[PDB]
Design a binder for this molecule. Structure first.
Ligand code: 3AM
Ligand code: 3AM
Ligand code: MG
Ligand code: MG
Lengths: 247, 247
């Protein structure tokens, strides 16, 4: 149904306005990257280890909001085939503060590795071209751990550690950018993970804001991503906590 | 039109799900307050001055998401008269990390002052009752600078400084919580203010995320808050930046 597709995407409009237009979103990005620099500078690693920073790309270092905008304007729910075309369009922007932090790490005895679920086989060329144009240093192919078979990221973090690096901090907009412990889990377990790690945020886990999509969307209901459009609309509306209007 | 009221509030649903349900939102709250503690501990003030922290309430220290949820469920655009009833309902929650940071400041040679546009005359009693119940220390009436005549906050910051305090940091979800320089201005000027203060975020300006409302909403278009419901919907949709779908 086209009506359902329209309602689903209309539900993203206000958060998209916030991410695209507000100074507040920019301030949060700068806040995150300012905190990240402090954590990096403070970090000490084991003897023999090299300092690594792990960074997610989409909505962490790369700004894909125009794809979301296209979804809104065309009543288009997410489709990986449309996403691939977006990547190939080479119109990605940079999240504020990301290039500076990236380049600072790489010039101060660290290395940023990009652990990202952009696809290695079909989305790598556009990703690298955009990042070069955007001013990121260190974007040789060896810095990238793009998605091959698995969306969960922990195995790639381990690959990095096997190369002689100690990861001093992680940057992301999705809790699954910090490990696998709540990958595919509902929001109750994900909030619990955050509580169990309260002191790490702004130190070793650096958060960027993303009100448009993510593991929290799937976390709204068991089997959310398997539901049809109407089912997803209902899951979102059912998750809403509302005042009863009484005193 | 009821159809317009419904569309306007439907546009807030996804960002509301994110704020209410996601671990990511909690992580951002903890990140902000972890950073705030570091800044407070580092702060030095002029001889003779007492250390003050200025904090906004709504969506900074107090969580009002159930009011937004009620708006969604009842197709109700914002109305200060409904808001007053919400305050009186005494169902406010605390933003994660806020009580701990508040109480830490107040027990470590500082004072948090609440500079908030909850209304002094009609909304003070519910505000204080909720904050007491939520566990905030230092919520005597003298800590509060609630709205009387003016929504712009700088004059109240000055009142605090005249009492012998030096403000060491500001906490908020709205750029207008940091001063008056972009109060009532459009988002271009507000983003410019953020850029001009890039290094302060996460240090002396502490940001909390709010994808549901704020000065950025009014900032979407000249005279936004004066427009009717259809006009506001059009302003939001017109602000959207969209990929053209081409390569
Ligand atoms: N609406 C959306 N739904 C799922 N993924 C999206 C998305 N918008 C952007 N993405 C990105 O596509 C990859 C696979 O999930 C992820 O890459 P990252 O690991 O973040 O670099 C998404 O964020
Ligand atoms: N949807 C909304 N629109 C305007 N204000 C809202 C709002 N939801 C909550 N508020 C709050 O009402 C006061 C006046 O603007 C502000 O208080 P604070 O200065 O943030 O404590 C709003 O955030
Ligand atoms: Mg991401
Ligand atoms: Mg506020």
């Amino acid at each position: 149904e086209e009506h359902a597709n329209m309602q689903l995407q209309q539900q993203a409009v206000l958060g998209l306005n916030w991410m695209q237009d507000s100074g507040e979103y920019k301030a949060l990005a700068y806040q995150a990257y300012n905190a990240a620099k402090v954590a990096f500078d403070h970090a000490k690693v084991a003897k023999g280890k090299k300092k690594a920073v792990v960074a997610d790309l989409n909505e962490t270092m790369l700004d894909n909001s125009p794809y979301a905008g296209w979804q809104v304007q065309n009543n288009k729910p997410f489709d990986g085939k449309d996403w691939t075309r977006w990547v190939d369009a080479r119109q990605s922007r940079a999240v504020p503060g990301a290039v500076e932090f990236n380049n600072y790490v790489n010039s101060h005895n660290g290395k940023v590795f990009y652990v990202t679920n952009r696809k290695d086989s079909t989305e790598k060329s556009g990703t690298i071209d955009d990042m070069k144009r955007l001013g990121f240093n260190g974007v040789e192919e060896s810095a990238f751990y793009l998605k091959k078979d698995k969306s969960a990221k922990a195995a790639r973090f381990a690959e990095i550690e096997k190369q002689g690096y100690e990861i001093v901090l992680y940057v992301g907009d999705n809790l699954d950018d910090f490990g696998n412990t709540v990958y595919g889990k509902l929001n109750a377990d994900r909030r619990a993970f955050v509580d169990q790690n309260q002191g790490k945020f702004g130190k070793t886990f650096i958060m960027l804001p993303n009100a448009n999509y993510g593991g929290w969307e799937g976390g709204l209901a068991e089997g959310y991503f398997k539901k049809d459009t109407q089912g997803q609309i209902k899951a979102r509306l059912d998750a809403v906590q509302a005042w009863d209007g009484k005193l």
